[PDB]
């Protein structure tokens, strides 16, 4: 399949247009990603906003200027020639009816399958403040591609200069069953099987490990054998340092 690679330059750029424009919950900042969608690895090296206006009274009313779309994409070619139109990004926590009608706009100048991106300034719950989706039809069918972040050498190192485990893993793992339980109950009363079929595939696949439980305990003992030997090595240094500490005390008594 394909994967979406979002550079930290793009994630931080979309967060800037939200605060500078004083965008409230009634508006969502829309922008255009730039990159190469030809290969299986989709990387976005550039992002910019657009004068978008949102209307909550009518989902079919949106203000977008196509002149600024083609001009800015042409003027930014002088920087890097690898930047083309692979899709667009927009703000807001949720996908409303106005987002479905604006999907067919950029598809005229886009060759391959466009890429959609949702930027969340609040980042409420779990991970992934920016979720990526693909727009394709047979009815609109959206698929969530794996979201990864990879930058250049100077870009990844520059983040560390500006900033100069097990418990968290168990908390998010427990919340996965709580969030899935609410999705099944709400969908049960919504119908009164296709959506629940995909969740049943993952949920079904000492229950099945009973055959490997005997062989698992034998491997855990071998792991402790290495840990027991390394523990003795650390214990020898404690006695060696205790004798070494006395040599310093013996010099303090004579001198």
């Amino acid at each position: 399949h394909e994967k979406v690679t979002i550079a930290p330059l793009v994630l931080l750029s979309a967060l800037d247009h939200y605060e500078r424009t004083q965008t409230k919950e009634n508006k969502r900042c829309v922008g255009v990603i730039l990159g190469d969608a030809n290969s299986s690895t989709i990387r976005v090296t550039n992002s910019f906003a657009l004068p978008f206006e949102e209307d909550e009274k009518n989902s079919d009313v949106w203000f977008l200027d196509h002149n600024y779309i083609e001009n800015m994409n042409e003027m930014c070619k002088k920087i890097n020639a690898k930047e083309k139109l692979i899709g667009w990004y927009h703000s807001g926590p949720k996908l409303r009816a106005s987002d479905l009608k604006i999907n067919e706009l950029f598809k005229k100048y886009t060759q391959n399958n466009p890429l959609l991106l949702i930027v969340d300034v609040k980042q409420q719950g779990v991970g992934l403040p920016t979720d990526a989706y693909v727009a394709i039809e047979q009815e609109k069918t959206f698929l969530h591609l794996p979201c990864t972040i990879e930058a250049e050498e100077a870009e990844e190192i520059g983040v560390e200069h500006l900033l100069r485990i097990r418990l968290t893993n168990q908390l998010k793992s427990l919340k996965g069953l709580q969030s899935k339980l609410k999705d099944v109950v709400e969908y049960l009363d919504k119908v009164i099987h296709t959506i629940l079929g995909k969740l049943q595939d993952v949920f079904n696949l000492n229950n099945l490990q009973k055959a490997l439980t005997v062989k698992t305990n034998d491997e855990l003992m071998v792991i402790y054998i290495s840990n027991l030997v390394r523990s003795i090595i650390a214990f020898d240094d404690l006695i060696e340092n205790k004798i070494q500490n006395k040599k310093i005390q013996e010099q303090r008594v004579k001198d």
């Binding site: 996908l95 009816a97 969530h144 996965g176 969030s179 999705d183 709400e186 959506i195 993952v202 696949l205």
Partner: protein
């Protein structure tokens, strides 16, 4: 149907099929020399037995030797003849217990268990957070509209 037969072949209908339709099977006078049809009966039986034990390894992990002799249309002495050639030539492998009359698959443990075979359990929850995260937004679309 004869090509796909070897997978499901129990050798129960083997004598029945050869009698009704025998174009190349039992009696063949074309492009085959011989003094009788006994060569067609011996040569065809050698192939259906080798393919019979081959699919058992992929289906029956443990089977009684007494039941295996009835499925192979052989005897105690004739069963050990055909299986000895399959293992010696490096085709397949099986378990033969003469005093215990037990025939098993003999699953190799050389894979070091958890050190390798655990790769089947990583794909179980790989689609867990991915499918749920996609349905959270999808369900809210139909609920809001």
């Amino acid at each position: 149907s004869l090509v796909k037969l070897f997978t499901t072949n129990e050798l129960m209908r083997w004598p029945i099929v050869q009698k009704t339709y025998e174009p190349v099977l039992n009696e063949d006078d074309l492009a085959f020399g011989g003094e009788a049809n006994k060569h067609h009966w011996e040569d065809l039986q050698k192939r259906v037995i080798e393919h019979n034990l081959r699919v058992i390894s992929e289906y029956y992990s443990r089977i009684t030797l007494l039941r295996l002799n009835e499925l192979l249309d052989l005897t105690e002495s004739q069963t050990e003849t055909y299986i000895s050639d399959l293992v010696n030539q490096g085709i397949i492998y099986a378990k033969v217990n003469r005093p215990a009359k037990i025939v098993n698959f003999e699953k190799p443990k050389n894979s070091s268990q958890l050190l390798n075979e655990w790769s089947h359990n990583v794909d179980e929850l790989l689609e867990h957070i991915e499918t749920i995260g996609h349905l959270i937004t999808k369900e809210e679309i139909m609920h809001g509209l």
